[PDB]
Amino acid sequence: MLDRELESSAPGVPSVSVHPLLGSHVVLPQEPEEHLWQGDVGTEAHPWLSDHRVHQVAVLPGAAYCEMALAAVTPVLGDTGEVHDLKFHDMLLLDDATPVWVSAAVTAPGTAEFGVETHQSGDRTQRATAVLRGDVDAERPAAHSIDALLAAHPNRVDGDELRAGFGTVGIGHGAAFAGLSEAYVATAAEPTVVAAVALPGPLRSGQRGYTVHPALLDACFQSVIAHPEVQNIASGMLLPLGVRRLRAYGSTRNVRYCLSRIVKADSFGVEADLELLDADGTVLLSAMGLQLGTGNSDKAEEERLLDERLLTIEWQQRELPRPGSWLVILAGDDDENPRAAGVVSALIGAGMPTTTMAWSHDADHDAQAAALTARLDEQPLAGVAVIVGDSEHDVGADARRGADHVRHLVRIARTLADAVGEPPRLYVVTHRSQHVLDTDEPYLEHSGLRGLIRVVGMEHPRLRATQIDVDDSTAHEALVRQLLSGSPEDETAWRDGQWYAARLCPSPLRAAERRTAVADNASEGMRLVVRNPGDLESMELVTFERGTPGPGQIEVAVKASSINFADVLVAFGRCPSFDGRLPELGSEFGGVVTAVGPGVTTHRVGDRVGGVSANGCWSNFVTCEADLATKLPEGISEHEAAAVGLAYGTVWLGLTELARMSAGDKILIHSATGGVGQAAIAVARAAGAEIYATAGSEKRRQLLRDWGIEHVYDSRTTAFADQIRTDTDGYGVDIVLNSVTGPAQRAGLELLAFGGRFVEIGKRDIYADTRLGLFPFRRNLSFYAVDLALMTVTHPQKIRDLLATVYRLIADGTLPLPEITHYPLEEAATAIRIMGGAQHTGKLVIDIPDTGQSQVVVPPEQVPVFRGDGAYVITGGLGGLGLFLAERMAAAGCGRIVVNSRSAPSTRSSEIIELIRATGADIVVECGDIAEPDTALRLVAAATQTGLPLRGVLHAAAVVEDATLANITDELVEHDWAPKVYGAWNLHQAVQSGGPATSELDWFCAFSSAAALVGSPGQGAYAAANSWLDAFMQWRRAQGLPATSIAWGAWGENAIAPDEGAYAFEAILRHDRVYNGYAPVLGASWLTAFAQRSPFAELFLA
Amino acid sequence: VLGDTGEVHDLKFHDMLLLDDATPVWVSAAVTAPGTAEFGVETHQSGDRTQRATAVLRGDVDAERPAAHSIDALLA
């Protein structure tokens, strides 16, 4: 509109052009040339950013920081430049609004430090850092022949096919990030990829002021994965971690191709060099040294894999929802079932024509099978309820009976499957078959049937194989309610009047699923720590092995320790440290020497001492250096010294030592109601200084006024400054014990006059690199930084003397001790909530229990598991997993490993045992059929023989005979059942039967199968044997004995690897969880098929 | 700063800013206490920072709109 422009040539709105990401730019008024941008990278501001998402959560791609760095070059360094050593730190998770701060600072001419950070509730989080360089030479790589390149790379890779592959590992690329059309490759020998990238149509409008659009640059990074050497080697989650050198030669608007080159292709990561070419082949941008990789740590990769692979069955309290003839059939005729009687009466009571069948063991099964098939063809029925009979506490009997039930349910299930018409719904009613409520002790016999009904439902889904695990107390009126409601639930249970329903889920927790113990407080190590800072509920009492001290160290028996404000920040994760590592809870202590390490003349055992250590002083025993402890004088207790130490030390150092607090001079004590505050008052009163104090609460301020201190102000504002200037007739103060921050720090410096002694104890502003204006220093001011924590490492003698001098002054009575409020170790979190909320006054002391009392404690991975002072037994050790585990255990440090297998050792097995015995650890081989009882005893006696107590068992012994329900013979059931169930019981008995050597074991593990859990068709007999063995472990745990079961997946020698399972096995044992299911889950065919068929795997579909 | 109606308190000017074709100035307001903020204008040239103006800002003050006058009566 030529008119609109001429009339608008007068009222113009004041606006300025900005970068889409970087946003508003400000150059700070300081040397060196320091720049600063503030901008939004939220999904509301930049919709297209929602299309890049890791694990279904929108995150900022690596490519975004690349653009930000490239963009920040020209304004800082007014020239053509590069971006060197660009690194991506934490993963930025995007919201509707995600403000981000970029900042570049000139270090040297033609060089500048770059950095993208994000600020949340005061806490800064660095997201990326690099170096900008302008001095670099204009070395534009020569244009390429797009025709020749594409001719040299004939093998085409589709973009959608590759982006689908990214979705499996967890990385999602939406419409915006689908720029990669297709990538052309050749072989692994050829290290290059010619990719056909292009910024999608919607984003072409939004090319705006981008050096390179991050959507486009990420599509180039995707192109690197199309290389065959990358696909073959690094078959894991590859995320960009950084870029060695980034330069833009021109506009990337017309980029149509991306030429990649593999520098290095390793299992850990992939390095590559990129070049963005236009249609002609001219280079527009180059990325040398693009580093991709498995996000963080090698050990953190294992921990993450283990979590995804684990599986557990969980029971949910459910209600029967919404809105034909029936047949009730039995499994024991000589046993009169009131459940069967009551069910038939309740179905007829509901108004359904019910018939009853009496199939029992030791009966003509071919004739009864024909009688059943006749009843089905005679009348069309809706469902068939199979009532399993319960005989009449002996497990031995229930293990033998459990086989007969499986053999009999196969006979019944086979005849229902072989139906001319539409098969009716099968309902199997078992008596306390499996564990649902934590209080339950499982009734076996029916334990094996849950694996069979799961396989029958998979082999023959027409008849929806449903299981109903009933208890004695429940009522038949509520049971038939389930049969007639027709809910699609396949695994169900009844405990009292409540209906439960199973559901498969991964649960790799480490809270209740971690070992527990009880430990003495006089003996045995126990320490207090936060498993994850921020949450005070995560404050745990952990165990530690208190070892011999030395050289030049001392073990102290702590009677008490303090709670400093520093220990609160540690609890919330807000504590700053020069080391970088977050310190341990408890800095100071007061105790009695336990042991003196070789060799120190200074300390003696039984000396009452107080000191410092780190390493957690909220524990019964602390090992501290001789440099950090001092004998307490007679005038003070362990608890008095534990409170005083740091508060008075910091003050002593700060006021009387650094600031040389003279008499009469005015002192400003910030937050004077606290520990350091009360200590400051004490020495200020002693020195004869005029006190000016501050405090947050009115109640807290009024306390200072009552303590006899005139001149009290608010610590949360900058009022105190002008108020003190008025209350001193413009003089101000002399000394300032600054615990406060920000403008209150600056205001405090501006306050003190001539004498000027600013003592900063507060670390926040130092670690934040706050540019402190030097102009107030024109009056001979003196700034003092104080970090006793650091001093304890750099000059421990000065800290020794500083503690020793305050313990002397306080014991002499030269200084009076402050308000001390004791807290038992248990209520430590409560003291933190109080201190952390500014509710407290004075000092808070943690009292350590000097008693013969016991306290419940948690061993994380201090668990023994594999040890040289203990023997081990492995059934099925001469082959399969057992031989790999035995070899791994011998290497892990095990004294005597008895290996068993009914067959003699093979030629390759004997060779493996020879090299293990050659490399120290002895391996005994005692053959036998574990199904026979004498074998279990012979094994146990052999493992103990070398003066070693049995510390663990492994039940890998197994037979696998697979057959379809139609051809599952009665003999084949006993073949698979015998080693798994009879061996497990004979092992259990051999352990109890054994003397005190066997009554000391740490674990009892049993290798189960994932086929029992899901229902792999054809297994059946093997599946049922495992479901009994899985329930047997929950029963063994219920009795108190240790017990474990690991339902394994598919091993190698997509499928579990050998060394992958070794870590999982060892890990599962470090934790107190009975059922563990290690199996490759990802997005497998058998899981996607199982999730859509039944609501048991509801959480897997999502 | 204070997303509301506000007063500017104790506005002081110090050194006389002489202007050139370019004279960059940095304004800077920080919250100190609630509904209150230290305001400050300054200029950095050759390494010497020069505070050209300062004040406090208040958003907690009450809108006591002075009464309107009679333009014509006033002129009489």
Ligand SMILES: NC(=O)c1ccc[n+]([C@@H]2O[C@H](COP(=O)([O-])OP(=O)(O)OC[C@H]3O[C@@H](n4cnc5c(N)ncnc54)[C@H](OP(=O)(O)O)[C@@H]3O)[C@@H](O)[C@H]2O)c1
């Ligand atoms: N080596 C060292 O550098 C060193 C040694 C010791 C202590 N210090 C520093 O000195 C300070 C006091 O130590 P202390 O334990 O002896 O005294 P303290 O009074 O026990 O420490 C806590 C006080 O900090 C104030 N505070 C401000 N913001 C707070 C928040 N978000 N949460 C909780 N409290 C808050 C509260 O006082 P008001 O409400 O009265 O303002 C509270 O009483 C700490 O800030 C600590 O880092 C430094």
